[PDB]
């Protein structure tokens, strides 16, 4: 059919930046970290997924989502050319 | 302590029928699968994203990136 | 007793047909796939089960459900003959 | 990516007492167990089906089959 | 403290008797079976546990619950004797 | 097919403080743990039972026992 | 960001003291035990975690929570000294 | 029988931004992870605690400790 049913929807994205004790240092060295909360909905019935993100993990997420954006745009371009 | 961590990101681009379109034009959609590890026992969160939701995601995560880098810098000079 | 309690009930069946990139081809070859959503209810408390179906899996489902139909009809026939 | 896939289908035909029947005639019922794999970690969805629900299921899945085959054909000639 | 909090409560017990095809016979031999549904509540938030019971499993359940009854009565007897 | 089956039954008798008693008399209570197998992957349902709830349980399960035996007998002579 | 999102909140703590038969004695020797119920909330959506606690486990919990208190106070002290 | 037992306790002290503060002063917070075993198959309950919630926790658990010790003593002399 058309798009009437669909996989869960990401409907909220929030975050917090904490300072914590690092694990890469023998001494008392503080390092930042992200707490990320995504709220996901099914078409009501909202769930929350909370993860802890480092800088490198965030950069990798950003690269991946950029590649997804590029693939979506290329498919849209091929679709507009019937 | 071991908070849940995003350890993999996979995706697929599908083409589906549009529901709102008068011209019935097909539309691209992203199936996004995030793999979260908690510790083994990895879970998978699957969502469907449109282009606009992905763009907004990117904007928010870039803001997180900038804030994290600013805090890192202020910690280095502290 | 009689049929007052009962196992969960299938109360909705919906689907979508997507075009995706195939895995059986080295080149860029598109293949269709089904997203099937079944809504299941307990006698209220509705849950959703979404699966991805290929053509062959769908044909096998159809064979199985046909065999179930045949067995139900044979049992009904034996029941009408006391 | 690995969306959940139906990997097994099993069933049993029971005879139960009818609740609506004036004549108290016994009635056949199907216990249907679908095994869904996501990847190991297979889950099982169990439902009870009457003959009419099964018939409607069959009709819907046949419609899916026809639509899938039509899309396949239009992709081959595309 | 006293008994203010408590483990989940069994708040409903229902069942059905089905006839099914047996597994102990090569031929078509029908055998009865029980579908048992227990409804369990937390002190609201009701859940349902459905199991399939054979005659022997039911007899064993009955023996176990009888032994529990005997132990509860013996403890009550010791409590009434301060 | 493999419906969930009760495969173990364990219990403990505790003594707790009574909440309704004027005389504050202690009271026995049963912690009941049913182990259910579905197939490995056994789950555990824990409840708390009073003497009266246990008695009612026993009555209901005895009724199930009698009904099952009657159906068995009518199948043997069928 | 600031503290707008947050991990689940502990919002209730209740308990009961039971007498049970001990496992360290061959004879009939009674021993106390704690049933502890913690109610945890997400910012609505309250869940209950019930555990059985022995005296030694409780003492260890108390030591751990005291160490947490000390670390929180030391961090607060370092924060007040800019 | 095997009721769920708390088998590990881990924690982290973070510094976060305060939301109610006029002076925007940073504030310490505790991320607390309790590991519960039921029997293998250990689960993890994570909460965030402020200093006041921790103090109240400590008071309640100390009351439990005193009650448990009093019952132990009255059992020894029983």
Author numbering:
A (entry chain B), C (entry chain B), E (entry chain B), G (entry chain B): 1 to 43, 51 to 89
B (entry chain A), D (entry chain A), F (entry chain A), H (entry chain A): 5 to 43, 51 to 89
Sentences from the paper on this structure:
We determined the crystal structure of the Commd9 COMM domain to 2.2 Å resolution by single-wavelength anomalous dispersion (SAD). The overall structure of the Commd9 COMM domain is composed of two cone-shaped chains that are tightly intertwined with each other to form a globular dimeric module. Each monomer is comprised of an N-terminal three-stranded β-sheet capped by an α-helix, with the overall arrangement making an open, hairpin-like structure. A simple analogy for the COMM domain dimer is that it resembles a left-handed handshake, where the sheet and helix from each monomer represent the interlocked palms and thumbs of each hand respectively. The overlapping C-terminal α-helices of each chain bury a large hydrophobic surface area of approximately 2100 Å2 (nearly 1/3rd of the monomer surface area) supporting the notion that the native state of COMMD proteins is to form dimers via the COMM domain. There is a very high degree of sequence conservation seen in the hydrophobic core of the Commd9 COMM domain, particularly along the α-helical surface mediating dimerisation. The high degree of conservation, and high degree of hydrophobicity within the dimerization interface strongly suggests that all of the COMMD proteins will form obligatory dimeric structures through similar mechanisms. We attempted to mutate several interfacial residues, but both the full-length mutated COMMD proteins and isolated COMM domains were aggregated due to poor protein solubility (not shown). This provides further support for the essential nature of dimer formation. The COMM domain fold is structurally related to the repeat domains found in the PUR (purine-rich element binding protein) family protein Pur-α.
The COMMD (Copper Metabolism Murr1 (Mouse U2af1-rs1 region 1) Domain) proteins are highly conserved in metazoans and unicellular protozoa.
